[PDB]
């Protein structure tokens, strides 16, 4: 959460060299010291005829701030023939990608063009350069015999690089094949022990590589970004690469096997053209040793307050479960247009608390697009989504945006002190800056006053001037601090005490220190050890009865304290910082004796009570619950009184109750300090005798499914008096209940079919629907809207199959959506009919002979339904337009259901049942 911004290390490069475009740390194994690795993709060189071949510079941390290049290669363009070059190094953007290990550093030139040896070309295949002290070898996995766009001609391998712990390089060439991309992992030494300066190809033995995919995958850009970590099983680092253009410009991130190179996982973007994949990064952000995936889509447009789309960016934070699944969350940017997941750079453990950190970057943020960097800390839960600090660029634009934060790197402890560090790179001004992490101290203060309950008529000490005895009380204040790093020995502090803080500018300061009659005393002690809490003490008196009126507004003593510089380490006084979540204020309370008759002790009688109003809450929705408490004091004084309501994992306190003339508006507040959630309420500091209170605490119970049958609360008041300080813990439980409004809607596609029947021929034997009739379609829908869900139910449909041996509405087949399987007592579609190929009224069951479909349901939650789609065919014998009243029939269909089972067995579940019908009226229309 904190690192020096006062005095960071500034580094520079040539105007337009793009210095600071690729940053990294150099930690040789052969030396005690460490360095900076900064790429200058556009820097000119002394290589014959090479304009802006670019470079890489090793910068000194030894406070010299001098960076001289690194001799990767100084030769010009190699030949193939006379005035026919073989390759073209000018404008190769060498330095655009930089990574290293111990002595081993890989730097590439993704804009390196190569004239194929077959035809005269200029293809951006790209090459790298792996140096190791003296031995320097060119690594160009993409410079193969297979060329042109269709192959690896435009691979630009070196776009993104990275090493695995087992010393193996992962490379990214976006333009491979048809710009789909490609990954190539080659183990070093196989890269080193295979280099032959006389071959522009070189096959590597244990090489791993992704293959050409279908045409549809073209232009995806796999290799745009790369990060590495262990996801798949155990062993080594697996490959992670961002495919910013995958899908439909949606984006996708691929995870590959660290050895097979087979696809493990995949990630897809939510909003297209957002560049979901521009940057990737894997780190265990929550100390459970599991690499977590972070993905940046700097152009994501989130919905702003007003509802309008706004480009601000977003970071996909996928946390790795033990099962191999993910608990992926989301994190949006703060300003519009400043890109955000443009650069995710995982830091070590800045604060060093056993949880890793990470620094997301908005290169074009701040004022005048000077960009800012946000450092987000980790925790057992996941990543603390709130920035713990923001690093702001300080450089103005030269000819284009400074781009501060475009490329950043932090994880190695470049300096002495025990915490990591960070390198950021503003290349629009050609710079790199070293932000040194500062020492973190955790401090523990203590404040305790001797007589706690002040007595006016006590004769103990004596005033400074006059030796007049006065009512005494002592006050001491211990202080203990110890940090985890390079800092101790002299943690000096400035402490400040305060008597009667509650007393504003009104001036009725009921208490004063001894020898210096004033409520404000100043001091400055010291310490260092983690258990040697040096403690200072004092003496304070109380003013005589005839100087003020109090009425017992507790004399609260206050304590403050703070660090100081010249506690820092030699190399530019690296001043420490107190932990973020540690208060510099501690304050206790005093109480003039009053009404605590004769034993001098104020021993009360406390009692709570809750009426059990509204005995039920249903399972499924949020159940509003108000509690009516009756807290009172039947004993004497109750110093610092308070109600302690204990609540479960799904309680959640809303607020008090104002919307009532009978209830009180207590100073209730929610709290969890321990592995416990609970509500507290001020019952008035000195909760006077006979003081009766009756208020309302509302909640909103979330369910948690089965999980037993009732929910307890534990009420109790607790005070500061040495005797009878607490009330009997009164427990209160409310019972869970089951409610599931289930219903059955039905409908008919052609609800009305007019019998004059346009175009129809009476066939000897039907073969198609057209030979039969129209398509009358019934649809029944079983839906559960109730809070509680059910586990099983029964559905019964009765079909008006035929009347007197004669068919009417021959079902072809039926379809189901949701949790249900069906079965017809009769075979549906006996006459094997297929698609195109080229009494007085009411009918249905009861009158006609049924064909029944019985369906087994099971699993309809709070807002889920089950649908049955019956597809009929009006069998056109509904004719008989000759003799009587063939004039009109109404084909009735009716389905019913019975919810037979629920997931809760504990609660008294009753059966839900109901029915409905569906008609298809076939009338004569014209006549």
């Amino acid at each position: 959460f904190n690192l020096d911004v006062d005095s960071p290390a500034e580094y520079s490069g040539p105007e337009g060299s793009y210095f600071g475009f690729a940053v990294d740390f150099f930690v040789p194994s052969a030396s005690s010291r460490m360095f900076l690795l900064v790429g200058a993709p556009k820097a000119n060189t002394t290589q014959p005829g090479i304009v802006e071949g670019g470079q890489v510079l090793k910068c000194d941390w030894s406070s010299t701030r001098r960076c001289q290049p690194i001799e990767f290669d100084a030769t010009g363009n190699r030949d193939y023939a006379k005035d026919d070059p073989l390759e073209f190094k000018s404008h190769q953007w060498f330095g655009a990608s930089v990574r290293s290990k111990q002595d081993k550093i890989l730097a590439c030139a993704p804009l390196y063009h190569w004239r194929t040896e077959m035809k005269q070309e200029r293809e951006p295949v790209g090459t790298c350069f792996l140096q190791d002290g003296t031995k320097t070898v060119e690594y160009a996995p993409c410079r193969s015999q297979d060329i042109d766009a269709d192959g690896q001609g435009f691979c630009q391998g070196g776009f993104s690089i990275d090493f695995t712990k087992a010393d193996r390089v992962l490379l990214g060439g976006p333009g491979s094949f048809y710009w789909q991309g490609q990954l190539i992992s080659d183990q070093v030494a196989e890269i080193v022990s295979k280099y032959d300066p006389n071959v522009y190809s070189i096959k590597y033995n244990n090489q791993l590589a992704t293959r050409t995919a279908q045409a549809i995958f073209d232009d995806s850009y796999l290799g745009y970004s790369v990060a590495v970590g262990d996801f798949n099983g155990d062993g080594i680092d697996d490959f992670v690469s961002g495919v910013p253009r995958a899908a439909r410009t949606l984006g996708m991130v691929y995870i590959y096997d660290g050895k097979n190179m087979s696809s493990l996982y995949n990630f897809t973007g939510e909003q297209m053209a957002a560049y979901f994949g521009f940057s990737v990064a894997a780190t265990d952000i929550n100390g459970d040793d599991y690499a977590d995936v972070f993905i940046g889509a700097p152009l994501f447009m989130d919905r702003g307050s007003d509802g309008k789309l706004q480009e601000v960016g977003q970071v996909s934070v996928s946390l790795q479960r033990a099962s191999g699944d993910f608990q992926t969350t989301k994190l949006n940017g703060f300003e519009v247009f400043a890109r955000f997941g443009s650069a995710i750079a995982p830091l070590g453990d800045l604060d060093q608390d056993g949880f890793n950190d990470i620094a997301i970057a908005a290169p074009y943020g701040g004022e005048d697009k000077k960009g800012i960097v946000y450092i987000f800390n980790g925790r057992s839960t996941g990543l603390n989504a709130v920035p713990s600090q923001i690093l702001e660029g300080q450089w103005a634009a030269r000819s284009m945006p400074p781009s501060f934060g475009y490329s950043m790197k932090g994880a190695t402890d470049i300096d002495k002190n025990g915490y990591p560090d960070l390198i950021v790179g503003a290349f629009g001004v050609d710079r790199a800056i070293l932000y040194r992490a500062r020492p973190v101290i955790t401090v523990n203060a203590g404040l305790e006053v001797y007589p706690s309950i002040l007595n006016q008529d006590n004769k103990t000490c004596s005033l400074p001037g006059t030796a007049l005895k006065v009512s005494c009380f002592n006050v001491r204040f211990c202080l203990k601090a110890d940090g985890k790093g390079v800092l101790p020995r002299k943690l000096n502090f400035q402490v400040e005490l305060l008597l009667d803080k509650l007393k504003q500018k009104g001036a009725i300061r009921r208490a004063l220190f001894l020898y210096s009659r004033s409520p404000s005393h100043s001091k400055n002690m010291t310490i260092s050890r983690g258990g040697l809490m040096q403690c200072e003490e004092l003496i304070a008196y109380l003013r005589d009865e005839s100087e003020f009126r109090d009425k017992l507004t507790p004399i609260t003593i206050f304590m403050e304290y703070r660090l100081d510089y010249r506690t820092a380490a030699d190399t530019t006084g690296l001043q420490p910082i107190l932990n973020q979540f540690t208060p510099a204020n501690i304050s206790r309370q005093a109480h003039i004796l009053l009404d605590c008759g004769e034993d001098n002790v104020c021993k009360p009688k406390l009692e709570v009570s809750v009426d059990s109003d509204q005995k039920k809450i249903y399972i499924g929705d949020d159940n509003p619950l108000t509690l009516i408490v009756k807290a009172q004091n039947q004993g004497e004084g109750a110093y610092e009184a308070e109600l302690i309501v204990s609540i479960p994992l799904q309680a959640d306190f809303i607020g008090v109750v104002r919307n009532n003339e009978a209830l009180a508006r207590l100073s209730c507040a929610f709290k969890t300090e321990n592995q416990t959630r609970q509500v507290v309420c001020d019952l008035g500091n000195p909760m006077k005798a006979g003081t009766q209170l009756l208020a309302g605490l509302r909640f909103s119970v979330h369910q948690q499914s089965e999980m037993d049958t009732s929910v307890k609360f534990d009420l109790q008041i607790q005070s500061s008096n040495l005797f009878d300080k607490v009330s009997p813990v009164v427990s209160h439980k409310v019972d869970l209940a089951v409610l599931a409004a289930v219903e059955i809607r039905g409908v008919s596609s052609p609800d009305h079919v007019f019998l004059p029947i346009p175009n129809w021929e009476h066939k000897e034997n039907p073969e198609t629907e057209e030979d039969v009739g129209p398509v009358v379609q019934h649809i029944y829908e079983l839906r559960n809207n109730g809070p509680s869900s059910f586990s099983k139910a029964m559905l019964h449909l009765q079909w008006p199959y035929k009347y007197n041996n004669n068919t009417l509405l021959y079902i072809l087949h039926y379809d189901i959506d949701g949790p249900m399987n069906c079965t017809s007592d009769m075979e549906i579609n006996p006459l094997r009919i297929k698609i195109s190929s080229l009494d007085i009224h009411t009918l249905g069951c009861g009158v006609a002979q049924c064909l029944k479909i019985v369906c087994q349901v099971g699993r309809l939650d709070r807002g889920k339904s089950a649908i049955l789609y019956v597809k009929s065919l009006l069998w056109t014998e509904t004719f008989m337009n000759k003799e009587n009243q063939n004039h009109s029939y109404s084909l009735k269909s009716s389905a019913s259901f019975n919810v037979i089972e629920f997931p809760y067995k504990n609660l008294p579940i009753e059966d839900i049942t109901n029915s409905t019908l569906v008609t298809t009226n076939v009338t004569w229309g014209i006549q």
């Binding site: 953007w93 519009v336 809607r745 052609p750 007019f754 839906r783 807002g863």
Partner: protein
């Protein structure tokens, strides 16, 4: 007291369906300017009227994909322009026409790299010679002679690119932020026809080509009419395109080929006001596409707010059809050109800040006309007031774009927008950025789903039984037009063949059996072919 005013300061009135405006400076939004004066936590109601002024001067620019594939699209288009005027004349007394073409950034990855130098000039691979890459060139600004368009479009030759996606977004930009060059004029309906038959490069794609300087949104064409930073500056983002589009009041129409249509459609859904249309293979279709999109642009009054102090918030209520009101909305669709709509705006500050002119805007999208609001303020342990979640203090007063006691509620209707556009599919109402269905047996995020709901044959009948029969409801609420649109037709004797639609049948008031059909293909068609000659009882 010290009352809060709302004094209208300038009241130019709508120019009733008169687009040519004889020095009448043509108004389209009535209350041109007002000046309210708020006090602490006080509000003030007012309103604004805006009409789709008939005969509004159009402007049309022709941005086309000049990739080798759109060679045949240059054939059946060299005649166009002249062919366009006869259509647009029926729509405007004045019309400017224009042209300009794109290909892709003339650099390494996209362009034909540099194998033989014999390529910097053409596309030598077949034997035919075309043209070198160019990115974006402006030829023929916006002029009157619909023939001049034909003269230039004849002089146009196609080019050839290596990469699949073209870099036409750079063009959409330059052809929006370069007002003078193109010749976009003030009081005139603006239209940018973006024709393309292939994918496109988005922003950041330029990293490969070595471009790390992002788009600035400024004009970069020079006297030579070629986009200069084409090679020095990366593609424009959906946000920045979207930004400059609204500021210059341009309407982006995507005339795109079938293969790539669904694409530019989701690209359409991120740039509101974008119209997509299925261009033909030989792009002859470009017209009954253009003269179509125009109808779409002028069938909705969306209200946009430029600026506005964070301190105060506006609340809108759009009344559009027969003065029935629609609360919580600043947009009306389904309109015909000439109609007028009214929105009743409100304003309130949460405790007045410090004096300043503070003058903001409220205007329809695409319209030059706007309502200028100058605001002035007549000013001269813990806190249980909470519950959190936007709730402030004193006693709890939510922020702008928030409502309700606890402050859970929202003003946003976008979460209630639908597939079709109508709020909550027409079956329900938006309540705190979330539909609550007036359940005819329906459910869904926007109430889209309704299995047990009556078939279309029942929904559409309502239409035919009026648009062709002058009776039933719709006739009764005067809504059998904007509400029940589509397109009816009295189909000769029997009906249609294409079995990609439903055939309906019904008995009407007069005891006769009406027979229709609901179709829907091409560009979202919706004909209702009505078999004329209903079967009725004889005598």
């Amino acid at each position: 007291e010290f009352p809060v005013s709302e004094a209208r300061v300038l009241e130019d009135r709508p120019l009733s369906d008169k687009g040519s405006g004889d020095s009448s400076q043509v108004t389209q939004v009535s209350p041109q300017r007002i000046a309210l004066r708020l006090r602490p936590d006080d509000s003030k109601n007012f309103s604004i009227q805006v009409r789709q002024v008939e005969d509004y001067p159009v402007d049309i620019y022709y941005l086309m994909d000049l990739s080798y594939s759109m060679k045949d699209d240059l054939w059946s288009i060299q005649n166009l322009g002249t062919k366009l005027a006869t259509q647009m004349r029926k729509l405007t007394s004045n019309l400017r026409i224009g042209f300009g073409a794109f290909v892709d950034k003339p650099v390494s990855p996209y362009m034909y790299i540099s194998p033989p130098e014999a390529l910097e000039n053409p596309c030598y691979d077949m034997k035919t010679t075309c043209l070198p890459m160019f990115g974006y060139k402006h030829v023929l600004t916006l002029t009157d002679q619909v023939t001049r368009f034909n003269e230039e479009v004849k002089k146009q030759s196609v080019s050839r690119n290596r990469d699949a996606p073209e870099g036409g977004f750079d063009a959409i930009m330059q052809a929006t932020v370069c007002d003078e060059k193109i010749g976009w004029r003030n009081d005139a309906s603006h239209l940018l026809v973006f024709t393309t038959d292939a994918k496109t490069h988005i922003a950041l794609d330029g990293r490969l080509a070595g471009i790390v300087q992002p788009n600035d949104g400024q004009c970069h064409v020079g006297s030579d009419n070629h986009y200069s930073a084409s090679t020095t500056m990366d593609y424009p983002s959906l946000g920045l395109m979207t930004e400059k589009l609204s500021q210059k009041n341009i309407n982006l129409i995507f005339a795109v080929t079938e293969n790539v249509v669904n694409l530019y459609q989701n690209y359409s859904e991120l740039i509101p006001g974008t119209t997509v249309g299925v261009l033909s293979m030989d792009s002859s279709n470009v017209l009954q596409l253009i003269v179509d999109a125009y109808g779409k642009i002028r069938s909705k009054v969306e209200l946009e707010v430029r600026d506005l102090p964070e301190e105060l918030s506006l609340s809108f209520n759009a009344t559009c059809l027969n003065n029935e009101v629609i609360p919580g909305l600043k947009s009306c669709m389904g309109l015909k050109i000439g109609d007028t709509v009214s929105f009743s705006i409100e304003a309130k500050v949460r405790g007045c800040p410090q004096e300043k002119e503070k003058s903001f805007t409220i205007k329809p999208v695409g319209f030059k006309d706007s309502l200028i609001v100058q605001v002035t303020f007549d000013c001269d342990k813990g806190e249980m007031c909470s519950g959190h979640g936007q709730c402030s203090c004193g006693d709890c007063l939510c922020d702008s774009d928030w409502t309700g006691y606890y402050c859970n509620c929202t003003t946003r209707t976008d979460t209630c927008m639908s597939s079709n556009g109508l709020l909550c599919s027409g079956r329900g109402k938006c309540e705190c950025g979330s539909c609550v269905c007036i359940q005819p047996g329906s459910y869904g995020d926007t109430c889209e789903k309704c299995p047990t709901c009556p078939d279309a044959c029942t929904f559409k009948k309502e239409c035919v039984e009026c648009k062709k029969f002058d009776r039933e409801p719709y006739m009764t609420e005067n809504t059998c037009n904007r509400y029940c649109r589509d397109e009816i037709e009295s189909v000769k004797e029997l009906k249609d063949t294409g079995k990609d639609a439903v055939n309906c049948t019904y008995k009407n008031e007069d005891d006769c059996v009406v027979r229709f059909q609901y179709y829907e293909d091409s560009s979202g068609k919706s004909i209702l072919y009505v078999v004329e000659e209903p079967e009725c009882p004889k005598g």
